[PDB]
């Protein structure tokens, strides 16, 4: 809702920053073993805990 | 873990097997049958002086 408390807004803010693709140059690191971002979240598929 | 991994053997029996194993280390056919290349060995119960 528009009416949200500061703790909730600070929680959604972290989830917003965290939901971004991995950098392109990460794959070039030695012994990378990461293909994509496995923790990607979509708003309409998986709902946040809170 | 309580599988009874260990076995106890009689002391008289263990000494018996030692006596037999020693008795067999003095017959060239038995040592050769173990495959020990005892062919240029001068004497099968080979003894050396204490200096070694």
């Amino acid at each position: 809702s528009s009416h949200k408390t500061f703790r909730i807004k600070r929680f959604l803010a972290k989830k917003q920053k965290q939901n971004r693709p991995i950098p392109q140059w990460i794959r070039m690191k030695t012994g990378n073993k990461i293909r994509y971002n496995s923790k990607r979240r979509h708003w309409r598929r998986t709902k946040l805990g809170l | 873990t309580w599988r009874r991994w260990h076995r106890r053997v009689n002391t008289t029996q263990k000494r018996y097997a030692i006596c037999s194993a020693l008795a067999a280390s003095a017959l060239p056919a038995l040592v050769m049958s173990k495959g020990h290349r005892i062919e240029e060995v001068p004497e099968l119960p080979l003894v050396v002086e204490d200096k070694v």
Binding site: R7, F11, G49, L50 | -
Partner: protein, 86 residues
């Protein structure tokens, strides 16, 4: 009707984030976390769930102070001293 239709009416949250333990089990209308029992002075912990105990036991987090303590014990918890300067 007990199935799909009744599932439309659920829009009021029962639990919220607990300031201790950070789990969404702080029952709003009871004011007591269902996971740690926050307003109580003691952490809620039951031996009938060994799996739940090891989800939250010591060492599953950061141990910001304890990991230093494990280091300092090896040298006898010395203080007030410095290595020989070069």
């Amino acid at each position: 009707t007990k199935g799909t239709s009744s599932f439309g009416k659920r829009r009021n949250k029962t639990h919220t984030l607990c300031r201790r333990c950070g789990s969404k089990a702080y029952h709003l209308q009871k004011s007591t976390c269902g996971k740690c029992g926050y307003p109580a002075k003691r952490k809620r912990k039951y031996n009938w769930s060994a799996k739940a105990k090891r989800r939250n036991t010591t060492g599953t987090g950061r141990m910001r102070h304890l990991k230093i303590v494990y280091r300092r014990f090896r040298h006898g918890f010395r203080e007030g001293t410095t290595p020989k300067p070069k």
